[PDB]
Amino acid sequence: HHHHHRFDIPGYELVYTAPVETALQADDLRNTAEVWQQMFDAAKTRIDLGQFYVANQQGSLLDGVLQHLKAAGERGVKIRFLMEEKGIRLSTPETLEQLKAIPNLELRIIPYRRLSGGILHAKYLLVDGEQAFVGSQNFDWRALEHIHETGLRISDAGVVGQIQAIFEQDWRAQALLTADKPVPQLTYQPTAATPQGNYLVASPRAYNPAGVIDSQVELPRLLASAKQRVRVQVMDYAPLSYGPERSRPYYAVIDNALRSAAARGVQIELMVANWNTKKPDIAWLKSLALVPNVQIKVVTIPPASHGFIPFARVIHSKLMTIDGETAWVGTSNWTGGYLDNSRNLELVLHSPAMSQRLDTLYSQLWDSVYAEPIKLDYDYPAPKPGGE
């Protein structure tokens, strides 16, 4: 059993990268780079990628990923790569040129703010309309090596079809925006039946194809249904949006649901990155730590031995388990901007098997030397994710 090197439930495989040089390895989960390479190798017709940005360093694991993507293009696979305009400033320009040089690849840059005010933040892949990948992993060499990252390879046809429809929607929207043509909003047509089983949730509502569950509705519904324990891991948690003139207006949707669950006696566990201990966010995090039944830990991943790496050595997985029975694996941090006005994707799996494996992964981090309880009395130094 022990030497089985992957974890699946029907329709879903759990895919995981631990930072190198940490006690966070999971030999039973396939890692991001190996899964992406195999997904590209299996492509016979189409590969679609929706990404926030593209960042590379010569000699990284992303080089192999890009090699397999290029080989797919050379094989005659049509590749459509959609990236957020705000991601350009985060991207490696040479890597963007390499992508454009792949045969049969079209690269489109979408300013998703012209649609809903936020960004294309989702990180996902589609192969032949048959398989998808959704996860925290950016198209970034650091996501493959230096960051705690979690995603799902999806073969559930219904869900893949919805992700494909979202990609098609945003691809065509990019072309309409380029021509200064209107992008019509999509009618909100929710199914009256309560969601069951395994399903996609997505944002923003206004550009969700028919029948795609609005994540901003579903996350509070899921939290309202919790009876015993909610465990959450994000990079960032804040009841705040990023507004004009650097303002940070209050954002209540998620925080109300967590506080409501806590008030019903549900135990809340929350893990965030040390990057989240910046001001003002740390004050609100301390505020949440005083709520009954809430425990918060801050996770610090140590630097890699060869030296400081900007915007790396951090936890990035966006995970939730409810009652050890329901699992959430998403692209969104839990602040304003993600579920309301940005393109994000989250998977909800009412799967005891997946929830148990995710709870083991969560406990591994929670119980590690990298996680420590929030300290109410401590003046957290400004994180310097970029350095110094």
Author numbering: -4 to 383
Task: Reproduce the article's own wording on this structure.
Phospholipases D (PLDs, EC 3.1.4.4) belong to the phospholipase superfamily and they are ubiquitously distributed in various organisms including mammals, plants and microorganisms. The catalytic mechanism of PLD enzymes was well characterized to proceed through a phosphohistidine intermediate that was formed after nucleophilic attack of the phospho-substrate by the first His residue of the HKD motif (H116 in SpPLD).
In the present study, the crystal structure of a PLD from the plant-associated bacteria Serratia plymuthica strain AS9 was solved at 1.79 Angstrom (Å) resolution. Two molecules were found in one asymmetric unit, and the root-mean square deviation (RMSD) value of 307 backbone Cα between the two molecules was 0.126 Å. The structure was composed of two tightly interacting HKD domains with slightly different topology. Two highly conserved motifs (HxKxxxxD) comprising the the putative catalytic residues His116 and His311 were found in SpPLD. The two catalytic histidine residues of the HKD motifs in SpPLD were both located at the interface of the two core β-sheets at the distance of 6.7 Å. While superimpostion and comparision the structure of SpPLD with other PLDs within the same family, an extended loop between β9 and α9 was found distinct with other PLDs.
